[PDB]
Amino acid sequence: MRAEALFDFTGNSKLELNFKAGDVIFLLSRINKDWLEGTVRGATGIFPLSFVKILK
């Protein structure tokens, strides 16, 4: 599925997915209850579920 970012998320590590509010993320899977793995802006990485709205 996909998720629309609600807030900007600037990760510290290259393992974390960077994005800005309004970006639509192509989800890859849940890594745990509070985090997702997804793709956007040419990169892949993990990010907090609470920073996006799942489009479903």
Swiss-Prot record:
Tissues/organs with expression: Expression is restricted to hematopoietic cells.
Signal peptide limits: none
Source organism superkingdom: Eukaryota
Subcellular localization(s) per the UniProt record: Cytoplasm, Cytosol; Endosome membrane; Membrane
Domain (SH3): residue spans on this chain: 2-56
Purpose of the protein: Subunit of the phagocyte NADPH oxidase complex that mediates the transfer of electrons from cytosolic NADPH to O2 to produce the superoxide anion (O2(-)). In the activated complex, electrons are first transferred from NADPH to flavin adenine dinucleotide (FAD) and subsequently transferred via two heme molecules to molecular oxygen, producing superoxide through an outer-sphere reaction.
Quaternary structure and partners: Component of the phagocyte NADPH oxidase complex composed of an obligatory core heterodimer formed by the membrane proteins CYBA and CYBB and the cytosolic regulatory subunits NCF1/p47-phox, NCF2/p67-phox, NCF4/p40-phox and the small GTPase RAC1 or RAC2. Part of a cytosolic complex composed at least by NCF1, NCF2 and NCF4. Interacts with NCF2 and NCF1. The NCF2-NCF4 complex interacts with GBP7 (via GB1/RHD3-type G domain).
Medical condition linked: Granulomatous disease, chronic, autosomal recessive, 3: A form of chronic granulomatous disease, a primary immunodeficiency characterized by severe recurrent bacterial and fungal infections, along with manifestations of chronic granulomatous inflammation. It results from an impaired ability of phagocytes to mount a burst of reactive oxygen species in response to pathogens.
Note on domains (UniProt): The PB1 domain mediates the association with NCF2/p67-PHOX.
UniProt protein name: Neutrophil cytosol factor 4
Organism: Homo sapiens (Human)
Gene from which this protein is expressed: NCF4
Stretch of the intact protein here: 174 to 228 of 339
